[PDB]
Amino acid sequence: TPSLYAPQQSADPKFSRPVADTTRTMTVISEQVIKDQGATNLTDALKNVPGVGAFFADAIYMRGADTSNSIYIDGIRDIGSVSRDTFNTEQVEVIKGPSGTDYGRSAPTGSINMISKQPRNDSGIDASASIGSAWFRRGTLDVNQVIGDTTAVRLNVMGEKTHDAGRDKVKNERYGVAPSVAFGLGTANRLYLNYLHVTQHNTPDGGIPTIGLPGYSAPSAGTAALNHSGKVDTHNFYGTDSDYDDSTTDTATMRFEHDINDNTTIRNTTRWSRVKQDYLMTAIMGGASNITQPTSDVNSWTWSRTANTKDVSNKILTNQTNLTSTFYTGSIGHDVSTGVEFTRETQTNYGVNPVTLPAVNIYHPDSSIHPGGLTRNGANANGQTDTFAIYAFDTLQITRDFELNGGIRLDNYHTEYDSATACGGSGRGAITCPTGVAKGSPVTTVDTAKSGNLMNWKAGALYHLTENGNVYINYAVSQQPPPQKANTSEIGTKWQVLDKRLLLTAALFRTDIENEYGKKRVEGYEISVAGNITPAWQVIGGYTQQKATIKPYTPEHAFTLWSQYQATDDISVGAGARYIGSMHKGSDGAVGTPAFTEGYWVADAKLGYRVNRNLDFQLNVYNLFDTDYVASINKSGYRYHPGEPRTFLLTANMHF
Ligand SMILES: C[C@H](CO)OC[C@@H](C)OC[C@@H](C)OC[C@@H](C)OC[C@@H](C)OC[C@H](C)OC[C@@H](C)O
Ligand SMILES: C[C@H](CO)OC[C@@H](C)OC[C@@H](C)OC[C@@H](C)OC[C@@H](C)OC[C@H](C)OC[C@@H](C)O
Ligand SMILES: C[C@H](CO)OC[C@@H](C)OC[C@@H](C)OC[C@@H](C)OC[C@@H](C)OC[C@H](C)OC[C@@H](C)O
Ligand SMILES: C[C@H](CO)OC[C@@H](C)OC[C@@H](C)OC[C@@H](C)OC[C@@H](C)OC[C@H](C)OC[C@@H](C)O
Ligand SMILES: CCCCCCCCO[C@@H]1O[C@H](CO)[C@@H](O)[C@H](O)[C@H]1O
Ligand SMILES: [Cl-]
Ligand SMILES: [Cl-]
């Protein structure tokens, strides 16, 4: 049977073949891995993919490219930019390399697809309660109930509140509710209805000065004392008691499926979703012109505070039709996947008055101040993108051993954008009032439309060398809206060994991007392992070696491995280790800021104890050696996020 650590099939019907028979570098992170590791969010889940992390500012990076706009939920773009909890996730599908034929407007470096939980054919209840470091509390509930011969419901509930063990005042609070019903299970006609609501209320973290890090230099001769005063206390909060981050997600999904016959299925999915967010966060600046020296003693010196504010609403409405069909023409088998997608996305950024923040003491920051919140001023920016997309995939079974595949996708989009600024101010990009226009009036500065076409295509071939091993090649030609062109070549090999419960892959890749700014190249090597070495022994991890020629936020070496062993009927033990290579900032870094970050190791451990079939406990320890490191650094180079210290998570799991 399948390993819980190596799901055999993508959930997306655009993938007609099992992962091991797919000519792409594709890692699936199962629900069981997420649970065993205590992963509460997408970023945590992604520790199982080497090199993928939120190294910037915080945004997730893959192969040197921001991936924030290449996150999907059930194959539909995730709108807005909020952290994603794992409570409603069945698995996470990560493609390393292009996926424009599958999603159109995605990063040619990789995509991430979170697969939502659906009603199952069995009845059961799981619940979890957790306590952890820094007042961490979390509760989850997952109820599945079969309600007739062909109907099932599922409900997932989550609540979490925590402070931050490494950071004063930073905190996160959220809850989520995700009810579903499915009709017609086990028949030719199925209807899935999904809803999801999440609310978050957080204190955001702008990070801390980079003084004293490797590569840091004071920005002037007159501030040379900062070459000797040392790293600031990594627990220091440089924001204010007014900083906050609020968001809500509301998503409704309706999926109809009709089997035309045993080998042909048509699907229609409608989703409406809205993500609202507003925040006030403190960004600190440490250039010569940002530093105040009330006396010559550095204990009195300050850096300037900048308010990073946002008040935004994103909406999407999309309808997607997919058709899959398997049939022969002569001796050639066909696996077809084709469809059409209609989408409207909108975004409103609500204008707010400028917020002014007092300077912050470098070594003794005073965050007790209450500058106040945001006030809308009615000068808004509004955007709309309408997209029509059509695609076709086919895998040709030429012989038992040889398969050819290909896909093509066409996107046509229309984008409208308008923006108004309240005139007469001075902060940020202020505007002088036109003649006769009273101060503070919103003045339209942009009002434009645009249209464009994207073509994406890919072709691959795969040869089964043995019953267990194959070799494959894949080629993809991508393009995004500014048209950014990307070509990718890939050759790899995939092996299912140890009763086919363990998947081993290796791939070489080369990607060339033009019109990103000139041409870039990223090439390298990827190895991965997932599944069961023995019935008691589960592993998942990988290794990446890569080089990103320019012509940033990309480790050239990265490793991760998680290993779990069922030591007795009641005792299991797990441990993980990940290496993040050093990274370099070629551009944008201010004078004297670190031009590089050092590589580091992080280790994690787990102990599980089963009391009976209804109750088991789990202890997770994160950053077991309490290692000090730079988790990320912003583009300016003035501020960074320190790696979290050692933390603990203790969970009671109940099953009924
Ligand atoms: C399915 C249906 C369809 O409509 O929706 C029902 C669902 C939407 O209801 C869930 C929601 C109404 O529950 C709100 C509750 C979870 O929040 C409590 C929280 C605000 O207190 C913490 C508080 C600020 O902080 C504590 C301290 C700081 O004072
Ligand atoms: C779990 C519990 C029991 O424990 O049972 C849950 C179940 C009784 O709740 C019902 C829920 C699952 O319904 C989903 C609802 C949100 O459907 C959206 C539909 C209207 O689609 C509109 C479509 C996308 O968009 C329309 C367009 C205008 O945007
Ligand atoms: C107690 C916990 C549980 O481990 O942690 C202890 C930890 C401290 O030591 C873990 C270490 C012993 O694990 C080694 C293993 C995870 O490496 C597998 C990798 C080399 O892939 C080879 C590949 C699958 O091999 C193919 C197969 C045919 O042999
Ligand atoms: C008893 C507890 C709980 O199981 O284990 C404590 C401790 C032994 O765990 C160490 C942890 C770091 O292992 C990570 C694991 C995934 O193994 C990966 C492999 C790289 O380790 C070989 C090894 C560390 O490297 C040797 C050398 C190359 O540095
Ligand atoms: C089952 C795993 C048990 C291993 C426990 C060893 C923890 C090693 O962690 C140790 O913590 C010390 C105090 O924080 C630090 O000073 C050491 O540098 C670090 O090695
Ligand atoms: Cl996240
Ligand atoms: Cl592609």
Residue numbers in the entry: 50 to 106, 116 to 540, 563 to 596, 608 to 642, 656 to 760
The authors write:
The ferric iron uptake (Fiu) transporter is a TBDT responsible for import of molecules containing the catecholate functional group. Members of the TonB-dependent transporter (TBDT)3 family drive transport of their substrates through interaction with the energy-transducing protein TonB. The structure of Fiu consists of a 22-stranded transmembrane β-barrel characteristic of the TBDT superfamily, with a number of extended extracellular loops that might serve in the initial steps of substrate binding. In addition to its role in iron uptake, Fiu has also been shown to be important for sensitivity to antimicrobials that share the common feature of a catecholate functional group or the analogous dihydroxypyridine moiety.
The structure of Fiu was solved in three different crystal forms, revealing Fiu in two distinct states. In crystal state 1, extracellular loops 7–9 of the β-barrel were disordered, as was the extended extracellular loop of the N-terminal plug domain, which occluded the lumen of the Fiu β-barrel. The disorder of the plug domain loop in crystal state 1 opens a large cavity in the interior of Fiu to the external environment, whereas, in crystal state 2, this cavity is present but occluded in the lumen of the Fiu barrel. In crystal state 1, removal of this subdomain opens a large channel between the periplasm and the external environment. Therefore, it is likely to be undesirable for Fiu to exist in the open-channel state, which would result from simultaneous displacement of the plug subdomain and disorder of the plug domain loop. Although the internal cavity would be inaccessible to Fe–DHB in the closed state, because of the fully ordered plug loop, it would be accessible in state 1, as this loop is disordered. Glu-108 is disordered in the open state of Fiu and is not within bonding distance of docked Fe–DHB (5.3 Å) but may form interactions with polar substrate groups in vivo or generally stabilize the binding pocket. The observed crystal states may represent conformational transitions the receptor undergoes during substrate binding and transport.
